[PDB]
């Protein structure tokens, strides 16, 4: 599945995971989306048209 | 010495049982604390962040 629980399936936004076998346990490879370059913009809650 | 040793061994065995009982109870309680701490950590991630 695709969990929405924060930091449950790794840091960042979860996309998918792949298990791997290990002696006496399991290892998960968690693939996540992480925001990178960003810019600062002016903002507003609403637009006044007519 | 040979008489004192009998009386002392009785006390040592009993004293060891008191300490073993203590340790066992602390381990059980600690497991319960661990579960609470794990819950708290989950809430921090999902409720706070």
UniProtKB/Swiss-Prot annotation, chain A:
- List all annotated glycosylation positions: 40
Q: Which domain of life is it from?
A: Viruses
Impact after mutating residue 37 to H? In strain: Kappa/B.1.617.1
Q: What does this protein do?
A: Subunit of the fusion protein that is processed upon entry into the host cell. Mediates fusion of the virion and cellular membranes by functioning as a class I viral fusion protein. Contains a viral fusion peptide that is unmasked after S2 cleavage. This cleavage can occur at the cell membrane by host TMPRSS2 or during endocytosis by host CSTL. In either case, this triggers an extensive and irreversible conformational change that leads to fusion of the viral envelope with the cellular cytoplasmic membrane, releasing viral genomic RNA into the host cell cytoplasm.
What name does the UniProt record give this protein? Spike protein S2'
Organism from which the protein derives: Severe acute respiratory syndrome coronavirus 2 (2019-nCoV)
Q: According to the entry, what is the taxonomic lineage of the organism?
A: Viruses, Riboviria, Orthornavirae, Pisuviricota, Pisoniviricetes
- Entire protein: shown range: 1035 to 1084 of 1273
């Amino acid at each position: 599945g695709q969990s929405k629980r924060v930091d449950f399936c790794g840091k960042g936004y979860h996309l998918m995971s792949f298990p791997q076998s290990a002696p006496h346990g399991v290892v998960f490879l968690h693939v996540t989306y992480v925001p990178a370059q960003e810019k600062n913009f002016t903002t507003a809650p609403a637009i006044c048209h007519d | 010495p040979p008489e004192a040793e009998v009386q002392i061994d009785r006390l040592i065995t009993g004293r060891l049982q008191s300490l073993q009982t203590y340790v066992t109870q602390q381990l059980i309680r600690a497991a319960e604390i661990r579960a609470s701490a794990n819950l708290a950590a989950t809430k921090m991630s999902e409720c706070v962040l």
